[PDB]
Symmetry: C2
């Protein structure tokens, strides 16, 4: 599992459950690559395989807007967007969500 995403809710103090996440790879346009929804643990595994996940620029779009929308909280952002170059020389993208703010970090091991 070369790419995992983990999403937390800073208002509720909980994982962010059932959040839609779309990954794109840069082709100079954006092409769909993977997607899924976070689990009960706020996690998204099995997006891609080592074979598929080659060097390149990737964008992870976290559909935070629909997440806040579904609990009746007014959100600011359309989404959280995390753009990074993946290089061969294992990635967890973690995001921490609030209605008017978000934080993201990469754990690369």
């Amino acid at each position: 599992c070369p790419l995992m995403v983990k999403v937390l809710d800073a208002v509720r103090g909980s994982p962010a459950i059932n959040v839609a996440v779309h990954v794109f790879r840069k082709a100079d346009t954006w092409e769909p690559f993977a997607s899924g929804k976070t689990s009960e643990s706020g996690e998204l595994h099995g997006l891609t395989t080592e074979e598929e996940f080659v060097e390149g620029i990737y964008k992870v779009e976290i559909d935070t807007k629909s997440y806040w929308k579904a609990l009746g909280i007014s959100p600011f952002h359309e989404h959280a967007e995390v753009v990074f170059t993946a290089n061969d020389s294992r990635y967890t993208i973690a995001a921490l969500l609030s209605p008017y703010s978000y934080s993201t970090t990469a754990v690369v091991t």
Copy 2:
């Protein structure tokens, strides 16, 4: 000044000076049109990107060029940039401050919206 950007550096505890910032607005075909751009000053602030007349309702993307920043300091960062996408002025005109806090493998962004 309806749209301001402030950028801080979490490694050095200082404003993030001379950081490029590009703002785009979503167009009538779901593409991103260039809207405004500039560079942060000594205080890590970017003022004068737009005017209230130009800053109409829409979906805007503020892209902070964190990669050239970190490279100009001699550091290899993770992200290509920091991005913030949001709808503005949807219920009338507002004043927006977009603040970002930068680390080589992380960033945070927050929005302060005034009437």
